[PDB]
């Protein structure tokens, strides 16, 4: 019943670490239509229109240390500008554990996401955008990891834990551990007046 | 205070130039089409602009290239068929 | 790559060329120099070496003869 597709795009100005985030998210998401590079705002709807994308992850970097994810629904959806502060990529050696490449995750959430309609919208968009469809073409059956989402100090801390089994269950943390500071929410996709500000 | 500076080259950016528009379009019709553009104009009529832009983007450099090119080919069709 | 992808790639620098009406002394100079250097793999070179290898390529005779060569080499390095 749920049928979705993500577009993973980049901007010129993305460094080493941020490139590894597009690598590892394209790994974890089986419905990730990975795209190389974009140069410029309005074009991204049309890219999504070509590949039949239900979602568009636009990773921007203005100053080369920064990262700004522009999560969106293409045709008329409310796009969300983030600023991602902390970063620990997939290829950091302290993390131990193999998730299946693009298996169905389990989305974990928080109480304070239902506190406002504001955090309710990002909660929903993280469910179907950062999540998975039940029958994605590159998706692996037996469920093997989670997506831990939790808010503290007005920012959502994202982690991906591989579940560990013994013969009841453990779970060792891996993958992109990062905060998401909700900067801005537009009314339409990359156009129209701004709904939310900080 | 400001002193209203002199105009430059790309401020009247691409000044229309009635003659060069004519020359580019004059060569366009005479030279025929490149083998990929020849496929592209068949692909608009059969499969549509969706796959046409997909092939054009793979063929050319960026997406802004594929916009201008498929539209250019759509004007080849718009003139050849009707007028 | 599917069928649809290769049909795109098929339109080369060298498409739309007649070949049946033309004299041989012209085509034998075109066909030598009409080869687009597409990237290869080691994975393909393996199978194409496995495709060309015929039956009498490695019989018992030539295996025994190969050892007969290497024994002579092992003798020649004790001749010094």
């Amino acid at each position: 019943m749920n049928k979705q597709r993500t577009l993973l795009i980049s901007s010129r100005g993305v460094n080493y670490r941020h490139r590894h985030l597009i690598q590892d998210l394209s790994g974890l998401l089986p419905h990730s239509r990975k795209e190389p590079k974009l140069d410029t705002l309005q074009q991204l709807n049309e890219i999504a229109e070509l590949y039949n994308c239900n979602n568009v992850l636009f990773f921007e970097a203005r100053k080369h240390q920064d990262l700004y994810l522009w999560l969106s629904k293409p045709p008329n959806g409310p796009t969300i500008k983030f600023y991602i502060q902390n970063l620990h990529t997939m290829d950091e050696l302290n993390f131990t554990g193999n998730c299946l490449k693009g298996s169905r995750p389990v989305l974990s959430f928080d109480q304070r996401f239902e506190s406002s309609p504001h955090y309710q919208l990002i909660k929903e968009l993280l469910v179907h955008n950062f999540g998975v469809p039940p029958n994605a073409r590159k998706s692996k059956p037996f469920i093997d990891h989670v997506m831990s989402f939790s808010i503290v100090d007005d920012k959502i801390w994202v982690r991906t834990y591989e579940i560990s089994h013994s013969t009841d269950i453990s779970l060792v943390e891996i993958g992109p551990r990062f905060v998401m500071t909700v900067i801005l929410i537009l009314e339409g996709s990359f156009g129209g007046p701004k709904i939310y500000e900080n | 205070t400001s002193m209203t500076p002199a105009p430059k080259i790309s401020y009247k950016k691409g000044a229309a130039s009635n003659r060069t528009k004519f020359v580019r379009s004059l060569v366009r019709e005479i030279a025929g089409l490149s083998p990929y553009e020849r496929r592209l104009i068949d692909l608009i009529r059969n499969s549509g602009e969706k796959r046409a832009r997909k092939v054009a983007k793979k063929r050319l450099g960026s997406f802004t290239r594929a916009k201008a090119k498929v539209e250019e080919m759509n004007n080849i069709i718009a003139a050849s068929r009707r007028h | 790559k599917n069928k649809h992808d290769l049909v795109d790639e098929g339109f080369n620098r060298y498409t739309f060329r007649d070949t049946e009406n033309l004299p041989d002394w012209f085509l034998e100079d075109e066909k030598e120099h009409s080869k687009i250097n597409k990237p290869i793999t080691k994975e393909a070179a393996m199978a194409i070496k496995e495709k060309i290898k015929a039956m009498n390529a490695r019989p018992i005779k030539k295996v025994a003869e190969a050892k007969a060569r290497k024994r002579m080499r092992a003798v020649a390095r004790l001749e010094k």
Binding site: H31, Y51, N52, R137, K138, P193, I195 | - | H4
Partner: peptide, 28 residues
């Protein structure tokens, strides 16, 4: 067709249907 929240009009496009076509660099 409809409008934005503040003074401007928007164009309501139909929803985008995620369909694996004849060519999408990936098959069944």
């Amino acid at each position: 067709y409809s409008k934005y929240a503040d003074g401007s009009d928007r164009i309501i496009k139909p929803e985008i249907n995620p369909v694996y076509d004849s060519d999408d660099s990936d098959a069944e």
